[PDB]
RNA sequence: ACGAGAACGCAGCACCAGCUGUCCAACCUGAAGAAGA
């Protein structure tokens, strides 16, 4: 119950800048056996 | 003062010998420790 707008995004912070990374993203590669 | 008197149907003998209550069978199936703004 909250009075506010659709959702927003989740990024982070790493060092100094703030290097804006999505959360949870990783890349996903696949090989046989 | 009896077709009667006396006379254990009794003695010894293991209901016993051999034989698996065993064979086959996944405690298994699905599920983001995760999300406001």
Redesign the pocket.
Same mark, same amino acid.
Not at 4 to 8: D, L
């Given at each position: $119950?909250?009075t506010?707008?659709?959702? $927003?995004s989740?990024p982070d912070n790493v060092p100094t800048g703030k290097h804006y990374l999505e959360m949870?993203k990783a890349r996903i590669k696949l090989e046989e056996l």
């Open positions: $119950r909250t506010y707008s659709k959702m $927003r989740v949870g």
